Amino acid sequence: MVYQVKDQEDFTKQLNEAGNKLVVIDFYATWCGPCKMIAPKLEELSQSMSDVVFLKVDVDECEDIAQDNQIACMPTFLFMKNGQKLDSLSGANYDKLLELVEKNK
Amino acid sequence: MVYQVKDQEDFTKQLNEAGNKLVVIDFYATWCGPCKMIAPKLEELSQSMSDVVFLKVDVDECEDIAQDNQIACMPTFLFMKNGQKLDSLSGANYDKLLELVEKNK
């Protein structure tokens, strides 16, 4: 599953529940074409990779979180582990997403 | 000064008000760092150039306008003249922006 982050507190809770697992966070908007395009692929990946945590943040609903992460070009995928940033990807390039997951899991 | 488009009807009103002038529309978000950094430059261009009209659209306030113009990155600048789309620019590249303005005005 790809869990929808509710607010800053929820984001923190989810980053903790991940323990030592890679966390992939999709910063998106409902008005974003490329975002809607790649969302099903992220969901598919999440169903198989139980050792990676997949989250999504609607930038319209969590503007404070978007500002914290210097989001600009969507979808943006942020890669974190133990609450710390490892990498970031701008745009819906699925191959680059898989490469960064392989690298950081 | 850069006028903020209020809604879809307002967007047509501003496009009509521009007459024959090039219109530069800044699609932005209040959480967008690069958007904030370039906003004063746009204000200065707006104050200085009398043959170009500058508009801005807050994607959180006008999600429908963002979707309809297939916005993905921010800021995105849309260049219109007499109701026609001439060009688009993704990101806060001021030189490219200025190039497209000189080219299309």
Residue numbers in the entry:
A (entry chain B), B (entry chain A): 1 to 105
Original authors' sentences:
Litopenaeus vannamei thioredoxin (LvTrx) is a redox protein with a molecular weight of 12 kDa, which catalyzes the reduction of the disulfide bond in different biological systems. The LvTrx contains four cysteines; two of them are engaged to form a catalytic disulfide bond (Cys32 and Cys35); Cys62 is not involved in any interactions, but in human thioredoxin (hTrx), it has been reported that Cys62 is readily S-nitrosylated, giving a SNO modification; and Cys73, which in previous studies, showed a dimeric behavior in the crystal system of hTrx and LvTrx, mediated by the interface disulfide bond through the Cys73 residue of each monomer. In an attempt to determine if the interface disulfide bond is viable to be reduced or if it is a consequence of a crystalline arrangement, we used X-rays as a tool to conduct experiments of radiation damage to monitor the reduction of the interface disulfide bond in two crystals of LvTrx.
Ten datasets were collected for each crystal, with the purpose of analyzing the sequential increase in the absorbed dose of energy. Specifically, changes were observed in the electron density corresponding to the region of the interface disulfide bond (Cys73-Cys73') and the catalytic disulfide bond (Cys32-Cys35) of each monomer. The deterioration of the electron density was dependent on the increment of the absorbed dose. In the case of the crystal LvTrx-1x, the interface disulfide bond (Cys73-Cys73') remained stable, reaching a dose of 34 MGy. The interface disulfide bond is shown as one of the most stable disulfide bonds to our knowledge, even with a significant solvent exposure.
